[PDB]
Amino acid sequence: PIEADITSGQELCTELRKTIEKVHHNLEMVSSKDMERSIKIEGILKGLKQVEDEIVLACDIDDIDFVSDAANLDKNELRFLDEGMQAALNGEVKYRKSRMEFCKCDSETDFAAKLYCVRQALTNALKDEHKRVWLAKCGRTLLADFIRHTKQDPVKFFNAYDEMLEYVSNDRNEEQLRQDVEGRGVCETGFYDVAIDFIILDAFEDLKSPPSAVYSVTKNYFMSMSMKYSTLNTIIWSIIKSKRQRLKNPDGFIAKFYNISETVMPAITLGFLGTDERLGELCQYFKEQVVQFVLDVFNTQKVCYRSLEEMSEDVWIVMRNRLEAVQTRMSNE
Amino acid sequence: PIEADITSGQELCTELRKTIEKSKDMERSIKIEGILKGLKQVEDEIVLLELRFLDEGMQAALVKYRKSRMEFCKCDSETDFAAKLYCVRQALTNALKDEHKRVWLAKCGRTLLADFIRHTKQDPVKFFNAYDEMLEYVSNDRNEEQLRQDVEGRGVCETGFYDVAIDFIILDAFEDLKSPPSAVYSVTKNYFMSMSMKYSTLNTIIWSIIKSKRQRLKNPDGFIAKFYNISETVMPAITLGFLGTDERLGELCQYFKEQVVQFVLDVFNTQRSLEEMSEDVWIVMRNRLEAVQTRMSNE
Numbered sequence A: 001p002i003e004a005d006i007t008s009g010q011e012l013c014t015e016l017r018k019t020i021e022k023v024h025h026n027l028e029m030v031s032s033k034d035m036e037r038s039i040k041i042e043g044i045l046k047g048l049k050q051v052e053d054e055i056v057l058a059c060d061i062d063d064i065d066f067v068s069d070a071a072n073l074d075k076n077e078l079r080f081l082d083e084g085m086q087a088a089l090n091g092e093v094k095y096r097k098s099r100m101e102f103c104k105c106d107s108e109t110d111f112a113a114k115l116y117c118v119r120q121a122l123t124n125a126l127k128d129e130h131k132r133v134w135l136a137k138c139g140r141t142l143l144a145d146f147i148r149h150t151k152q153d154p155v156k157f158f159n160a161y162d163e164m165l166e167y168v169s170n171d172r173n174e175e176q177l178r179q180d181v182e183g184r185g186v187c188e189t190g191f192y193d194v195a196i197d198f199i200i201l202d203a204f205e206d207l208k209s210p211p212s213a214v215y216s217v218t219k220n221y222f223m224s225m226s227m228k229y230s231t232l233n234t235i236i237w238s239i240i241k242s243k244r245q246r247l248k249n250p251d252g253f254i255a256k257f258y259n260i261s262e263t264v265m266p267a268i269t270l271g272f273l274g275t276d277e278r279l280g281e282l283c284q285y286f287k288e289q290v291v292q293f294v295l296d297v298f299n300t301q302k303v304c305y306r307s308l309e310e311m312s313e314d315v316w317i318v319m320r321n322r323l324e325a326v327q328t329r330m331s332n333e
Numbered sequence B: 001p002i003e004a005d006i007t008s009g010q011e012l013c014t015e016l017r018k019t020i021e022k023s024k025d026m027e028r029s030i031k032i033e034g035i036l037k038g039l040k041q042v043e044d045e046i047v048l049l050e051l052r053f054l055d056e057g058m059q060a061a062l063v064k065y066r067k068s069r070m071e072f073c074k075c076d077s078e079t080d081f082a083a084k085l086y087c088v089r090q091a092l093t094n095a096l097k098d099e100h101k102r103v104w105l106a107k108c109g110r111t112l113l114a115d116f117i118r119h120t121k122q123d124p125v126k127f128f129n130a131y132d133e134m135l136e137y138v139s140n141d142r143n144e145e146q147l148r149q150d151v152e153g154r155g156v157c158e159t160g161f162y163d164v165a166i167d168f169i170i171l172d173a174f175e176d177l178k179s180p181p182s183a184v185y186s187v188t189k190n191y192f193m194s195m196s197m198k199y200s201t202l203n204t205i206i207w208s209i210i211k212s213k214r215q216r217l218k219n220p221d222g223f224i225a226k227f228y229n230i231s232e233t234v235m236p237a238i239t240l241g242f243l244g245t246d247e248r249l250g251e252l253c254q255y256f257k258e259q260v261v262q263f264v265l266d267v268f269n270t271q272r273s274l275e276e277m278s279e280d281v282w283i284v285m286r287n288r289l290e291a292v293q294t295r296m297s298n299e
C-alpha cells in the first residue's frame, strides 16, 4: 500500500514538474513582473525537480505501553466459548454497541459468544467481595492520583466515588440501576455492560469527537494549565447540570455517576485534549491498558475459554494487573 | 491562461503534498518528511504566484447572489427575489455614496454595539480599536481588491453593503446564534452562574475559536482577519445577550434582531425609482438603527 502511495506520488510530481516546465518555457517567451514571474517559476521548477529526484530514489499522545504475562493458548476445545456460541446462535446475546472489530473478532457470532463468556467471567470473579473492594480502592487511588496531577484536590471526587460505591453495594437499588441503564439502551447490568462498555469505552469514544469549541479551548497554547482547567470545569459542570435536568430520578444511577463525572471529567479532558505531554501521556497509558484489557479477555489465546473458573481466574488477573500498572504510572510522579 | 496553468500545478502539488503526508524505516521517515518539508515550500510559492424601478431588476437575471432568502422576505418567487434584491443593492450603494450617511451609520453602529458590550458591565475599548481598524480598511480604496478576494472566496457575489454586511455577516450571525454548540448553550443558560462567570467563559471560548479559525486565513491583515477582530471583542457580549438568562439584555437583543429583520422585510416590500427607493431605504434604515440605539441607551 505505502509503495502504491509513493508510486502514485512519483507520477504526480513528474507531471507537476512537466506543468511548471511548460509555464517557465512559456513565461520565458514574454515587464519586470513578467520577468519576476519567470524568475520565481524558475526557482519553483528547480525545487520540484529536486523533490522529484528524492521521491524517485483529537491528537493521540503515545506513551510507554507494553504489559504482558503467561497465557493458556494450547488447546482448540473451549466448551465455555461453545456454550456462549450456542447461546449466541440461540439468540440470547443482545449487545448495545457490538464492538466486534474493536474486539478483533471474526464475526458478530464470535463476538456474541466471547461477550456472553466475558460477561460471565467478570461478574463471576466480582462475586468475591474482596475483589470488588480492591478494584474500587484501585480505581479510587488511580483517578485520585490523576486529579492530583492536574494540581487539583480530589475531595469532591472522593465524595462522588464513595457516594457511588454505597449505591452499587446496596442491592436494594438494583431495580433502579436497571431502569436507568435499560432506559439508555443497555441490556444487562453486569460490570462489563455498565462499567466498561457504557461508561469508560463510551468516554474514550466521546473524547475522540469533542465539539469544535471545547477542543479549540483545550489546545490553546496561550492558556495556562489553570485557565484551561477552569474553563473546562465550567463547561462540564453546566452540561451535566443541563443533562441532570432530563433525568427521571435525581438520586438514581445516572445522577450518581454524573456526580463522579462532574469531578473527574475536567481533569481527564485536560489530559487527553491538552498541550501537556506529561498529562497526555498518562491519559494514553490509562486508555491503552483499559483497551488492552478488553482486547485480552476477548482472545482465546490470552485467557482460558474452557470453563467459568479458568476464565474467571484469567479475566481477574488481566484486570487486576492492568489497573495496577496504571495506578503505578499515576502514583510515582 | 498561464494563470490557470499555475493554478493546475497548485492543485497537483496540494494533492501530492497530502499523498506524501499519508534504522532504514526511521531513515525513510526522515527522508519523506524532508520531501514533504520542501514540497510545502514550493507549494506556498505557487500559491503566492408602475414598478418602474422593479422593471430594472425585473428579468435583470435573464442577479448572482449567495443565499435564497425568498421566504426570509416572503415575496412571490425566486425571480421576484432577484429583482427586489438587485433593486435593493442599487439603492443601498447609491445612498451610501453620500459620505454624511456613511459617517452617520458607522457612528450609529459603533455606539450601538458599545452600548451592547456596556450592558454586560464590560469595557468596549478593544472593540473600538477593532471597529476603527476595519473602518480604516474599508475607507482605503487600496484594500478594495483584497476585500473582494476574501468575500469572493467565501462565495459572496457583490461587494455592496447588503451583500457583505447584511447578507454575509449580520444575517449569518442571527442564524448561528440559533444553532449554538451544545457546550456554549449550557453555559450561557446556567442559572447558577453570575453574569461575570458567563461572559468570561464565553470570551475564552470565542477567543480560542477565532484563533483556531484565524490560523486558516490566507491574509493575517486581510478583510476577514479584520472582521474576526470585531468578532473577538463584541461577540462574547452578543452571545451572552441572546442566549443568557437576563431578560433585560435578552429583550434588548430581541428588539435588535426584530428591528433588523423588519428593515430587510420593508426594503423588500413594494407598497418605484432609483432616487425614490434610495430615499425610502435610508429612512427606514436610519429609523430602525436609531430606535435600537435609543432603547439601548436608556437601559
Ligand SMILES: CCCCCCCCCCCCCCCC(=O)OC[C@H](COP(=O)(O)OCCN)OC(=O)CCCCCCCCCCCCCCC
Pocket: A122, A123, A124, A126, A127, A132, A135, A136, A137, A138, A139, A140, A143, A164, A168, A169, A189, A190, A191, A192, A194, A195, A199, A200, A203, A260, A290
Ligand atoms: C475512564 C475511567 C472511568 C472511571 C469512573 C467510572 C467507572 C468506575 C465507577 C463506576 C463503577 C460502576 C459499578 C457498577 C457496575 C455494574 O453494575 O457492574 C456489576 C458488577 C459485576 O458483577 P454483578 O453485579 O453482575 O454480579 C452479580 C452476581 N449475582 O458488580 C458490581 O456490583 C460492580 C463491581 C464494580 C464496582 C466498582 C469498582 C470501582 C470502579 C471500577 C474501577 C475501574 C474504573 C474504570 C476503568 C476503565
Ligand SMILES: CCCCCCCCCCCCCCCC(=O)OC[C@H](COP(=O)(O)OCCN)OC(=O)CCCCCCCCCCCCCCC
Pocket: B092, B093, B096, B102, B105, B106, B107, B108, B109, B110, B134, B138, B159, B160, B161, B162, B163, B164, B165, B166, B169, B170, B171, B173, B230
Ligand atoms: C451582526 C452585526 C455585525 C456587526 C459588525 C460587522 C458589520 C459592521 C461592521 C463592518 C462594516 C463593513 C463595511 C463593508 C460593507 C460592504 O461591503 O458594503 C459596501 C458599501 C456600499 O458601497 P460599495 O463598497 O459596494 O461600493 C463599491 C464601489 N466600487 O460601502 C462600503 O464600503 C461600506 C459602507 C458601510 C461601512 C460600515 C458602516 C458601519 C458598520 C455597520 C453599523 C451597523 C450594523 C450593521 C447593520 C446592517
